[PDB]
């Protein structure tokens, strides 16, 4: 015979509730489903050129190709309204990752040990909770106030901070809330992080996907010595999540977080980096994508916002991202044939996440069915 | 002011000795000749098949494969890989034991290694790993607080596993036996009989066998590759492989793992690996479809070209044996590397493989890798995949270098 082989504690406690939960589907967080949103043609053709050259099939540096890091550094400068802020973004502090999902893993596991906690918004993109449970880090939720435009309850969060608290995480613009934070509110967050002396992690992957001529405020656009780790990429706004490319950018002017940066660098060695074809294709086109491409998608999202309004169930209208928030029992009865998502999944019972990114013809039929 | 932010223990102990090596610039006027590089794309002499390249083109232009794949891999590629590995099995039953349900698509074999070990072991466990070895097993183990417990390969018995010594290393915390076959850095290609013995060893000790078979297509001299798949056994085996080396595209970051477990004693291991793919959420969707379209269509001819190039590189290293300069070596039967054994008693001022590496580089601007990096001092890893003109020139400098330091 042969002794049964069991798995590790690490594997056993690694759970993704969304995926575990798994016809008109308003539950899907992937902009490629219908084809109404499209990757820019120049990116598609840069990929064609790059793979046909045969010059980008070799090993990249595990931290990312130099030129893509440089380009990403240059690209994020546009979110900075000032020269000093812009100069504070250095390519040396850019890391290319296998999607933002990996950037989250690297950020959290280079920073925390088992037994630590981080403060994370609720409701939230579930990956932070999943990564935390996987590695024995506590995901300590602070709550977002839906009646104050889904702003962070900074009064409450203060009471959650202790000696094992290692970071403060925000998602802005937000999946699942569709929120877009004001400049003053982002300033408060930074001050909060200063008062409590913890780094700020800002998931800014929807940066290009603000609606209604809204203003996006990146944690980069401030004069502060508070270390900030910005996570972003092209997966959502260039409609190519399956390419598995994203990045993290550290802004640390007084250099208080250098070991974190080194730790993240060292940990890229484990899977040894990112698809070399996509890295070069994005390095060639990231700065050349015209406002019009981002402007077509934003208009397409504004349409979905209009369709959900007919239901008015209450809701805070979306200012950004691809979702609106409007609980488990309601979800189950709808399928028995429309698919929504319960906010339970995201850390806040009593809501439903619905997607804005599908065609009106699909949405209208589903909103009517609701 | 602001509290200094420090890193985790996991980060602090994560080290890759190869990268770290990257070395004093040479005080020489000769051209830099690098024999240290483990990337088949370096010179352009070896080539990704055109049919794979044009499948990538069709796939990306379609705009139908830019979405999220399943974290475990696209269904069609998993089915295709399963079908592909069947050719390494000589029988219907062995072929039937390969199931696409037990294939996982990974971000290179490097991720496959992470998933295999961290889904199996807890901190405080150990695994048996060959030395010398591709450094990633050691790097991942140390990163995760798993002990990399070396058993030694024998350069005089064709770089075979010393199984007798390995037996004394097994204890209650030993969780796996790792082999690399064909081998980086040794160039060895195991006989069927040795692979049979390795499996028997794993049966006696009741530990799973992990086999890095990424050089499966790159056997030389009409050799026979024996996959751990090609056996009638209930020993659980996890095979790591991919297209990175033999289709000359390591940078695309695609590889896979295949679990073969006929009595289903390792289902939890499989479920664990699957769960852990959720953390980076999978693999480049363009390449998975491109490879799904072409993996079964690539002609034998594309590979025999690469093999021919490697056999020629091997002949050039053989020239080192014609001079009495203290270099012995088992000619490579596979993979892309050779291990040069140093007779240190030949040299007046060369104490170690490391010192040999430094002085060679400083004096002749030829870069090899000391075997220390791979877990076995007293050797040098040299690459066979470069063009003959590069190798021939570099071997001349090595010969000259040895004669000069002798006595
Ligand atoms: Cl990782
Ligand atoms: Cl991973």
TrEMBL record, chain A:
Domain Aminotransferase class I/classII large: 24-370
Co-factor requirement: pyridoxal 5'-phosphate
One Gene Ontology MF term: L-tyrosine-2-oxoglutarate transaminase activity
Positions carrying N6-(pyridoxal phosphate)lysine: 236
Keyword list, A-Z: Aminotransferase, Pyridoxal phosphate, Transferase
EC numbers on record: 2.6.1.5
UniProt GO BP: L-tyrosine catabolic process
InterPro entries according to UniProt: Aminotransferase_I/II_large (IPR004839), PyrdxlP-dep_Trfase (IPR015424), PyrdxlP-dep_Trfase_major (IPR015421), PyrdxlP-dep_Trfase_small (IPR015422), TyrNic_aminoTrfase (IPR005958)
Keyword Transferase: yes
Pfam families associated with the record: Aminotran_1_2
Family: Belongs to the class-I pyridoxal-phosphate-dependent aminotransferase family.
Name recorded for this polypeptide: Tyrosine aminotransferase
Gene name in the database record: TAT
